[PDB]
Design a protein around this ligand. Sequence first.
Ligand SMILES: O=C(O)Cc1cc(I)c(Oc2ccc(O)c(I)c2)c(I)c1
Ligand SMILES: [As]
Ligand SMILES: [As]
Ligand SMILES: [As]
Ligand SMILES: [As]
Ligand SMILES: [As]
Ligand code: NA
Length: 255
Amino acid sequence: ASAAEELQKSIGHKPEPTDEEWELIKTVTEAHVATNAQGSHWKQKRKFLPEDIGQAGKVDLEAFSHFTKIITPAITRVVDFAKKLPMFCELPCEDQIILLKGCCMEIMSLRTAVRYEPESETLTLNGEMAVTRGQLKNGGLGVVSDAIFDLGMSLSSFNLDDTEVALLQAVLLMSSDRPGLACVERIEKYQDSFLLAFEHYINYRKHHVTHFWPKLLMKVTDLRMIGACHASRFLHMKVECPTELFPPLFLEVFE
Ligand SMILES: O=C(O)Cc1cc(I)c(Oc2ccc(O)c(I)c2)c(I)c1
Ligand SMILES: [As]
Ligand SMILES: [As]
Ligand SMILES: [As]
Ligand SMILES: [As]
Ligand SMILES: [As]
Ligand code: NA
């Protein structure tokens, strides 16, 4: 189980998901697939943003406007993902907003990075709007745009499926280091159940890529970095752009 994990590996075998883990895996996957804008066919049904909005330095009002106008639906799908996870529900109100505010940008940026399109060198926001590096940058994200784009390009080789993306989200969600958490121990035990099932799913997947698990975990910290760096970007925006231009849900998640 969680203990018999050493010998098994120490002899050279890689345990695949136990039956209990297979259920957790299906729960997390369904939760993700059901709340991910579009699905399978997300890329023929997407519109590029006119090459003039991104103004191809103050934040470009037009881009910021187009981006903030569709941010509420994005945040909402993240809360929805969390709600479909039994472990999340087993936590106190106080802790739940904490976890959500903490992983929101981490998960959202993962969802747009995983949909990087190398042909047109674009990322797609909310499954509809496809933007370029500069557009997203000038829209208000600054270097965050570069971070997500670089993550996206690197992720191409990982060939992640819905389950792997879902498990990543689950690991980001259950972060017991968020300041102000009450149930630090319980939340850490949950992230452990996810990481254990995740690693096992990876052994079952058999990616023809060396040290997949470790490299994959490094992406975790990058997403955490993208989030922390976005919070700063948020302060840079609250000092230029006016409040009226900040969707109420967008304001409560990041401040
Ligand atoms: O793709 C999805 O599911 C969700 C998603 C939606 C958007 I709009 C988005 O861009 C942001 C995010 C924060 C921010 O302050 C600004 I300005 C723009 C990203 I990155 C991801
Ligand atoms: As609930
Ligand atoms: As509360
Ligand atoms: As608790
Ligand atoms: As950064
Ligand atoms: As920053
Ligand atoms: Na650049």
